[PDB]
């Protein structure tokens, strides 16, 4: 593949820059003779030549061209320019280009127009312009809809499909006369009959703002909607299948959307500039949602809400996903990343700001506290590997659509959010939002890199005369340009602090150099016997300060409420004082720091920085902990023990220990809910209740097993009167299936096939993977691959649910090794979250035998490659090596600890 030719290189030339496009698309919603669903379109792109060139290189993916005046395209001049004749065109598949070879060169700073006529498949592939399907009674409904991000706009029409190639778009949709056409903007005049065939209408839309190609959306459906003008005058509509809308299932979204949009407009002092923001829920959708500017698309499951069958956790999902997509109207649409290597400027911001918007709409839920579990601790697992990557990867490394898709990962989302949470904490949100307002104003309708953000934050810092140990850029560059995070180790006898790059495996090999030497500039907050001390900045690898020195009974903890992106170790004397505090009165330690103490110590133990028994000792007080968060932090960390040990002699004592620790909590909830008749008022208490049930049942509390089997049996006896509160359904369904047999399984499967809401179906689909019968798991695996039984959007998610079951481990890994080409080609090998399957199937590996299989899997498939799962395979290899050594080193001490402490 000759690298000297521009059309064989992945990045577009800088020689041409588009100005504006018109696009006409026409989906055919009934199959043709071939049984193929197709769309036909045309386009004109106007562009400026920035540097003289004899080739037009523009993106094109799976499009077929209708010849016009002897070629695939026609090239015309603008404002008097006179373009050369077209020599010939070619489609270059790897780089997804249409290449127009010219008989001469275009002229610098002149404009040109290029006309195309084309056709593509309206495939059920969830990418570009695609089809989604549902049933209304026995009538098949087919929807034309879109997903462009990252690199699929080019699959719908020829375009310069990179995010810094911003343009205006003039969209026309041609569609059956009975169906509604939607796009980013409002219709431009009324919808008129197609002259050649009045069975079709033609809907033209107003020109978009200047924007990136990946934000375009085109939808044709018979959906209904509810609507309300938001307090900032923007029209909000929630669109979904008619039955959902009539059932009122869009009403919650309508309650929160406009108010969140207005809240963000106010908080960032930057209006939303479009006349409307439609939210629309699609039956088939790859990701969770997509922030298309003016027409935000969602999985049905993440937009619709039924107050009589959806759980509180489902309700949290709706408001948080809406908040994230609305955050993007500012961070991503109005101001857009220059290139995908800086993705966190879109998604890290959306992941942080989503909590501010969700907290605005639901202030009693205290959602912002959950950032520590949902983001900080989530990303720290991968970011403690030598094979992690910086928040801002060098742009030169990110070239292919696979490499781009791969970056939609825990680093860009949750590390992005965590670093922003830290930043807002040390600046104050008042100062942070002032800098952000200036950033948004300056770069509106343009593109940014990470340096542009620091400049505007510096401006606010300078205006407020805030004194930092250096500039915003030099502090934040430490958290952005190098991977990883530090462990801060305190010696409370002398008050010394030291930092080093935290690695789960000390033996692992960091091959990525850092110009910052893996040293950070760290804002350190702290408490002494519960009282907050003065803040401190750690700039060097080591320092001394009496803030960190103790004597007598005093203890200190660093990182109050885990605002900072770092872990903390102490001398064992201070740890023993913390453990004493947890036994005396655990409420003296802020709840978030109770999660911290647990999660940090477990990770420190893996890294050989504290004995494993110290981390296990930190869970002893949980027997009297009622709060959601510290229990969730413990369960999260103990997940790793389950992965390492659930096929070993260690597992029984582990389960015995958890059964002892959770029983009083379970009994507390049994009494508090008046024998499961009620749910707690507070959302955190609701979540705590669900975990206590899940934990009690999984670890063999007999009252829990009886409760779930009894409830499930009562439902089977009364299928239309489900006695199980929505909050408990996931865990009751799973454990009833696990405790039961094929009769329970078949009932749940039938319920799943007959489901009317995605939420109920999702709970059943996860539950069916809880069977303990190998033959049932095998049969279920065969269903995941059948698009008539399990929608394609859900296939790999269900396979992951199977592999997480200890009996499905061998089954799924053997399946993955045996079917790699199929999974890669048909199940999203270059798309979002393909890493999820590699991660899930390999995370139990703790043996040389498994390692050798994984290395052989890498060798055997070198020709196919691993697409957007390439880094995940490297990380799987690193973790597997770490796990082998960790099991060797810990199995006997852990077995003895669980045995001695579970009685």
């Amino acid at each position: 593949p000759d690298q000297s030719k521009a059309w064989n290189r992945y990045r577009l030339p800088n020689t041409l820059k588009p100005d504006s496009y018109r696009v006409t698309l026409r989906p055919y919603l009934t199959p043709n003779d071939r049984g193929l669903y197709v769309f036909k379109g045309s386009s004109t792109v106007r562009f400026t030549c920035k540097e003289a060139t004899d080739v037009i290189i523009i993106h094109s993916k799976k499009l077929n061209y209708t010849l016009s005046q002897g070629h695939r395209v026609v090239l015309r001049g603008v404002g008097g320019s006179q373009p050369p004749d077209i020599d010939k065109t070619e489609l270059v598949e790897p780089t997804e280009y249409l290449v127009v070879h010219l008989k001469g060169s275009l002229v610098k700073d002149s404009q040109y127009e290029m006309d195309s006529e084309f056709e593509g498949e309206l495939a059920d592939d969830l990418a570009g312009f695609y089809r989604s399907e549902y049933m209304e009674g026995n009538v098949r409904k087919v929807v034309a809809t879109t997903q462009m991000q990252a690199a699929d706009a080019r699959k719908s029409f020829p375009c310069f499909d990179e995010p810094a190639m911003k343009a205006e778009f003039n969209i026309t949709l041609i569609h059956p006369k009975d169906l509604t056409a939607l796009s980013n903007m409002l219709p431009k005049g009324p919808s008129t009959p197609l002259p050649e065939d009045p069975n079709w209408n033609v809907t033209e839309f107003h020109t978009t703002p200047k924007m990136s190609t990946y934000l375009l959306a085109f939808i044709v459906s018979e959906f209904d909607y509810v609507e309300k003008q938001a307090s900032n005058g923007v029209l909000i509509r929630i669109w979904a299948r008619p039955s959902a809308i009539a059932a009122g299932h869009g009403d919650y979204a309508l309650n929160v959307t406009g108010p969140i949009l207005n809240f963000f407009a106010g908080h960032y002092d930057t209006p939303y500039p479009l006349p409307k923001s439609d939210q629309i829920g699609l039956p088939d959708f790859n990701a969770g949602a997509m922030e298309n500017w003016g027409l935000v698309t969602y999985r049905e499951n993440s937009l619709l809400f039924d107050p009589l069958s959806s759980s509180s956790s489902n309700k949290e999902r709706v408001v948080t996903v809406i908040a994230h997509e609305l955050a993007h109207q500012w961070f991503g649409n109005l101001v857009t990343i220059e290139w995908w290597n800086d993705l966190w400027l879109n998604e890290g911001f959306a992941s942080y700001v989503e909590y501010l918007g969700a907290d605005y709409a639901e202030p009693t839920w205290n959602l912002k506290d959950l950032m520590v579990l949902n983001d900080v601790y989530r990303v720290m697992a991968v970011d403690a590997l030598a094979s992690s990557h910086p928040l801002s990867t060098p742009a030169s490394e990110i070239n292919t659509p696979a490499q781009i898709s791969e970056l939609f990962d825990a680093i860009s989302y949750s590390k992005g959010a965590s670093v922003l949470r830290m930043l807002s904490s040390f600046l104050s949100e008042d100062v942070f939002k002032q800098g952000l307002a200036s950033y948004l104003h300056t770069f509106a309708y343009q593109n940014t890199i990470y340096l542009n953000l620091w400049d505007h934050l510096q401006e606010a810092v300078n205006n407020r005369s805030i004194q930092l140990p250096t500039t915003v850029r030099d502090i934040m560059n430490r958290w952005t340009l190098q991977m990883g995070f530090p462990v801060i180790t305190v010696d409370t006898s002398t008050g010394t602090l030291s930092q080093e790059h935290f690695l789960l495996d000390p033996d692992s090999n960091v091959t990525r150099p850092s110009e910052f030497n893996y040293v950070w500039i760290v804002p350190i907050t702290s408490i002494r016997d519960g009282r907050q001390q003065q803040d401190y900045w750690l700039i060097d690898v080591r320092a001394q300060n009496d803030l960190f020195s103790t004597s007598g009974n005093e203890w200190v903890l660093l990182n109050l409420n885990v605002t900072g992106y770092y872990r903390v170790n102490y001398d064992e004397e201070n740890w023993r004082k913390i453990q004493t505090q947890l036994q005396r009165d655990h409420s003296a330690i802020p709840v978030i720091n109770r999660a911290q103490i647990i999660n940090d110590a477990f990770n420190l133990a893996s890294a050989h920085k504290v004995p494993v028994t110290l981390a296990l000792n930190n869970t002893l007080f949980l027997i009297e902990e009622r709060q959601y968060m510290p229990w969730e932090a413990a369960l999260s960390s103990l997940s790793y023990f389950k992965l390492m040990f659930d096929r070993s002699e260690v597992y029984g004592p582990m389960k015995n220990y958890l059964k002892k620790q959770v029983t009083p909590l379970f009994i507390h909830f049994r009494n508090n809910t008046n024998n499961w008749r009620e749910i707690p008022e507070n959302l955190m208490d609701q979540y705590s209740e669900v975990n206590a049930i899940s934990t009690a049942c999984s670890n063999g509390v007999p009252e829990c097993e009886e409760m779930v089997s009894g409830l499930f049996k009562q439902w089977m006896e009364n299928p239309n009167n489900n006695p199980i509160h929505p909050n408990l359904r996931s865990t009751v369904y799973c454990n009833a299936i696990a405790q039961g047999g094929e009769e329970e399984w078949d009932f749940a499967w039938e319920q799943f096939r007959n489901a009317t809401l995605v939420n109920e179906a999702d709970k059943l689909r996860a539950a069916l993977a809880c069977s303990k019968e190998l033959w049932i798991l095998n049969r279920y695996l065969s269903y995941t691959l059948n698009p008539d039984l399990i929608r394609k959007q859900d296939a790999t998610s269900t396979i992951i649910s199977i592999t997480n079951n200890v009996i499905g481990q061998g089954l799924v890994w053997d399946f993955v090794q045996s079917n790699w080409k199929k999974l890669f080609n048909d199940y999203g090998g270059g798309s979002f979250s393909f890493s999820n399957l590699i991660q899930a199937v390999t995370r139990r590996f703790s043996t040389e035998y498994e390692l050798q299989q994984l290395e052989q899997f890498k060798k055997d498939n070198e020709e196919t490659g691993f697409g957007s799962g390439t880094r995940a395979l490297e990380q799987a290899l690193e973790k597997t090596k770490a796990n082998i050594k960790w099991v060797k080193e810990n199995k006997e001490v852990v077995l003895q600890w669980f045995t001695e402490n579970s009685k």
């Binding site: 990701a287 999902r317 996903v321 959306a350 825990a410 979002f832 890493s835």
Partner: peptide
Amino acid sequence: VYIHPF
């Protein structure tokens, strides 16, 4: 896009 935390 929104992707649920794995």
